[PDB]
Amino acid sequence: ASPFRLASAGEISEVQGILRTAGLLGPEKRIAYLGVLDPARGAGSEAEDRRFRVFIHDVSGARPQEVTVSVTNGTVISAVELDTAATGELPVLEEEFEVVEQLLATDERWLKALAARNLDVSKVRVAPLSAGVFEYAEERGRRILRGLAFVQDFPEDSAWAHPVDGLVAYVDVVSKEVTRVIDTGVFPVPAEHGNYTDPELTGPLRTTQKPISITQPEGPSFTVTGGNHIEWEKWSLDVGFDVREGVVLHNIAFRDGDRLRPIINRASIAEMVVPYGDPSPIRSWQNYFDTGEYLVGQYANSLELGCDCLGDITYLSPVISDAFGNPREIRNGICMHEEDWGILAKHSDLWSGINYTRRNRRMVISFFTTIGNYDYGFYWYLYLDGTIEFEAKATGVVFTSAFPEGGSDNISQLAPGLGAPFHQHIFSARLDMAIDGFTNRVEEEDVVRQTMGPGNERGNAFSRKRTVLTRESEAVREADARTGRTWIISNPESKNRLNEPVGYKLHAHNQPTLLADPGSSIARRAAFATKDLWVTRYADDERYPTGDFVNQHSGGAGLPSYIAQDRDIDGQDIVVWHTFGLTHFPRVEDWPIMPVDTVGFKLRPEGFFDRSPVLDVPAN
Amino acid sequence: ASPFRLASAGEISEVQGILRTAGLLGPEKRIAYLGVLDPARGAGSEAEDRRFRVFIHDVSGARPQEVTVSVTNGTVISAVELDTAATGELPVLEEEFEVVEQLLATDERWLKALAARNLDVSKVRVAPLSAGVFEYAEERGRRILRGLAFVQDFPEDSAWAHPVDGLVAYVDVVSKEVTRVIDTGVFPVPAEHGNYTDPELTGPLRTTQKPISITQPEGPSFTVTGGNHIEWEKWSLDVGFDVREGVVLHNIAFRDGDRLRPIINRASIAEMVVPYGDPSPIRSWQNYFDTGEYLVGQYANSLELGCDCLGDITYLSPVISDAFGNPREIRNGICMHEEDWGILAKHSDLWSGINYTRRNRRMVISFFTTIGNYDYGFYWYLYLDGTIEFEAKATGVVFTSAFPEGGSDNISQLAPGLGAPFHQHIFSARLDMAIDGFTNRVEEEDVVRQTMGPGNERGNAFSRKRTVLTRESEAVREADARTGRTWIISNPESKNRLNEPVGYKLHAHNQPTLLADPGSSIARRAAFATKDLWVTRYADDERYPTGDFVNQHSGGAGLPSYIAQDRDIDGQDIVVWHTFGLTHFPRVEDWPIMPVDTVGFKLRPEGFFDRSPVLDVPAN
C-alpha cells in the first residue's frame, strides 16, 4: 500500500519491458543506475505514481541517457541524452572492473614494465580506480579508469600485500585503448604475504572465548508491516534501499502520547569520498567517491546470522537491477534488531528513600558494503530517549604501496618494504529535516565565556548564544570544539509547554574536514567536504552534495551551486548536510586486515518533549 | 599473596586496633579517609608491607591528623597534626550531612526566612554543600558547609522539584554555629511535583518491551584469582578499590605471544569537579569536588542483577572503613562481565574469493555512585584489539533553582517556575603510564596541511608532525580538534619489528574545559581543569591533581605546584593527567530524572604490536 515500499522484482521487470519496447535497452545498452523516486511534496492526493530513474550507458560509444519511467502508467516520462564532457560520466559499471586488467594484459608498454620486474602477467591484478579530472585534455568527454597493479602469488593470495609501485596506466574503457603507461622507476615488490587465514600467520587460534548467547524468548519488540514499515518503542519509520545511497530512512516519527510527531523526513549518507595524501605521481590523482562513482548499495554483503548480526535478527532482502534490467535480490542485505544499551536512568535518593533504575535499549538498522579493498558498515540507531545516531564502521584492507627506502612524510610503513599512504574517509549525511512538520530553522549554539566583573563578581558565570541561519549564503558552517559548538534544528511554530520552540540538537564529532589544498581538483569536486555543516532549502532535484554525475565531473556541482541561490531557510522546508570523517594515518595494527574504526554523529531532543519521554519504561 | 589485593575486613580491624591502642581513636575522633597505599617503586624485594593511610577528624575542635599505619608490622609509622588553615580541611563526613539541617532548624534567622514563605520547618530539607574559599575571612581555618533548602511535601516526595531560592545559610559544623543567613528575596516555591514513580506522572507503563536474554552457557571467558586479579583475552590486571577514587586499575598488561607486556601501571579517575555558572549570590560559590571533597567510593551503590548489570556478572564486594574504624562491605559494589561488541574485522575479497568476518567483544568493569542529587557510573572497557576506554555515565536529578520571571542567561527552565543552572562535570584521569616498561615519553601529534607547489603539484598531500614533550614546564597541553591533535605515549627503548618505538595513542573527545574566569576561586582550586593534558614525572606523593586536602583549600595545590619542578620527562617514569568533561545546559528532557549522558576517552595501540593482535580470534 505504502508509496515508500521497497521496489519489487515485478516493478523492476516492468521497467525493463518499458525501456526495451521504447528502444532504449538495445544490446549495446547497460543500466548504470536504477532507483525509485520519492513521492513529491504534497502526497496528500493518494494518487500513487511509482516512478523510477534510470541511467543508461552505451558500450558502443553513443551518448548515455537519463530516463524517468512510470511503472504505474507503463510510460517513459522523459528521456534526455547526456553530454558527459559537460555534466559528468555515468557511475562505474561492475563489468568494467576486469576490463582494465584485460586491456593492459596485451599492451606492449604494460608488458614491458612487468617484464623488467620479472612479473608473470597472469599473476598481476589491476585495481580499477576512478580517474578524476586533472591535466590530461585528451580525457575530457571520455570514459577513463586508471590502473594500479598488485601481485597474486596464487589464487587465494591477498594481492594487497604485493603492490607494484612506480607504475600506473590510464585506460579508455569504451574505445578499449590504453592511453598512457607511466613508469617512474622500479620498486621492490614487498615479499611478505598478508594472508590472515594462514595458520603460519595467525598461529594457533584462541580457545579461551566462551560463547555469548543473545536471545529474545518472546520475539522482538518491533513490528514490520508492509515489507519495510517499522514500529518500535514509539518510533515509526520506513526503511528504504537505493543502489547508490544504500539504506535510506523515511518518515522518522515519534508517537508522543496520542500524536504522531515527525522528526526527519529523509535520512541518508548521500556521498562519501576517500582522498589520498601521497604526492607521488603514481597516486596523487587518487580519490574515489564510493557512493557517487561506484554505488555502495549494489555491493552490499549478504549478512550471516551469528557472524555479522547476532541476536534475534529480522532481515530485509532489497531488490536492485543488474546491468541488463533483470531484478536481483540481495539476500539478507539489511539486518535489524534491538540491543540492550545499559542504564537509561538511575537515582537513589537520600531523602525520599526511593531507589530507581531503568535500562536503555536501541533499535539497530545496518548493512555492510565492499568496494575493492575497503569494507564499510552503516549503522542507524534509535534510542528509547529520542536520540538518533549514525555510525560508520571502517574495516577491510588498507590500500598499499611500496615503502620508500629513506622513508616518507605521507606514507606509513606496515611491513618490510610495504607502505600505506595517508588518506581520509569523509561522509556526507543528508538530513531532510521535519521537526514537528516542515517549518524548520537552524541555529548555531556556542558556549559564551564571561569576564569577572559587575554582575559576575566571582567569575563563575558562563552562558550560551544562538545564531539563526536565515539565508543559504550564511548557512555554511565550521565546527568549533573549543566553544562546544552544536546546531539546533527547531520549529518556530511548534512550542513545548514552556512556550519554547521544539528542537533537536546535532552533536558532531568535530574531526578534521578535507585536508587538501583549497586549489586542488579534489577540493573543487568534493567541496561539501571542506565544511562541517550546510543548510539548503528543499528542492526535488537537489539530491547529492556532489551532483548527479560525480565520475569525471570537473567540480562545482552540488552544494556550492545550490547555496548560490541564497534562498530563505528561516522557518522553511530545509535540508541539513553534515560532513564528518576519519583521517587515517595507518598503523602497523591495521595490517594485514584492519580492526574496525568508527565515526558518526547523533541528534538529541532539545525541548522537543514536555518532560523526559522515558518515564513510562517499566522496571526489567 | 598479591600486594595489590583488596583490603580485607581483618586488615581494617587491625588498623582500628592499632589506632585505638596508640591513643589516636578516642570518642571525639572520626576516620574521614582510610585507604591502602600502593607498593613503592621497586617491589622486587617481595618484602610485603601492607600500609594504610588514615585521615582522622576531631569533632571537639582539636587539630586533625594524618596517620600512616603498617598492618604488616602492627605499628604507627607516622602521625602528623594538620594546620587546616594552611593545607586544607578533611573530606566531608557522611554524618555531617544531616547536621546542617538540624542546626538551621533552631536558628532564629532561618526560621524567620521559612515563616515568611509559609514553609513548615519539618518539611524543609537542606543540602549539605561544600563551601569553597571566597571572601569570608571568618571561615579561614574553620569547617564550613553551606546550605540550600528544598521542600518535601511528604516523605516520598522528590524535594528537588521544590527549591527554595533567594535563601542560603553558612554553618560551622564543629562549633555548631550558623555564621550567616542570607535572604535576597522571596521566590515562589515551584509547585509541580517531580515524582517519577507516580502513575499520574508516568501514565500507564509500556507493555511493548520484550525481554532480551544475555547468557553465557559455559560461563565467562575471564578468570578471577586472588580475589581481584583478572585474566581475559590476553589482558591481565588487578582491580583495586579506594574510598576516595573508587575503582582503580593496577598493572594493566597484555600477553603478546610468550611475553607479558606492561601498558599502564595505575589508572584512576583522580578528581572530578562540578562548577556552576549561575552568578546569583545564592549559588555563585557552588562547586563540589565529588571525588576530593566527598569521596565517591564510599557512596558506591549495591548493583542488582538484571537491573544494573545484565548478563553473566561476576561481583566484587570491596571493604571500606566507617567513621569509627569498623569494616563495612559494599555488597556487589563492582560488576564485571564481557559484552559482545559487533564486528571486529571484515573483508570479502574480489580476487582471492575469501570471505572473512570476526566479532569483537569487550571486558567491562564498572561501579555506580550517588552523591546527593547526582548519580555517576564509571566504566572501564578492555577490547580484543588492545584498545582501552573509559566512559562516565551521568544521570540522577539535576540541581534546581527557581526560574526567574523575565528569564535568565545562566539557567534553563524545566517546568513552570523551576530552573536548572548551567554547570559542567569535569573529570581528571590519572594514567601512571608503563608502555613496555617505565621509560616513556609523550609526543603531541598534529595533522599538517601542505600547500600546492613544488613536490605537491596536485595539492593533495597532507602529513603529520610529532613534538616530544621533554620537561614538565612544556607538558601542559590544550586540545585542537581542527588539527586532529592526539598524544602518543611511547617507549623510545622498545621497538617493534620495523624498528619504531612502541606506543599508544590517546584519543580525547575535545569537549570544552573549565569555563570560569581564570581569575576565579574555582580556576585556582581546579587548575587541572583549565587544560586538557598534563604530564608529570612520577613521584610517590603526587596522587591527586588538586592535592590531598581539597575541602576549603585556597588553591594552587596539586598539578600547578608539581610541574613547577620542571623535571625531565623524556624517556622516564611519567604520569599523564587527562581532563575531560561535559558542559551541561539542562533541557526539559532532563526533568524529572535525567537520561544518561556520557563522556570519556580511549587509548589505542600505535605500533605497539608487530601486526594486528586479533589474527588468532576464531570464527564464531
Ligand SMILES: [NH3+]CCc1ccccc1
Ligand atoms: N573504493 C573504490 C576503489 C577501488 C575499486 C576496486 C578495487 C580497489 C579499489
Ligand SMILES: [NH3+]CCc1ccccc1
Ligand atoms: N555532589 C555533592 C553535593 C551534594 C551533596 C549532598 C546533597 C546534594 C548535593
Ligand SMILES: [Cu+2]
Ligand atoms: Cu583508511
Ligand SMILES: [Cu+2]
Ligand atoms: Cu549536569
Ligand code: NA
Ligand atoms: Na525538510
Ligand code: NA
Ligand atoms: Na609511569
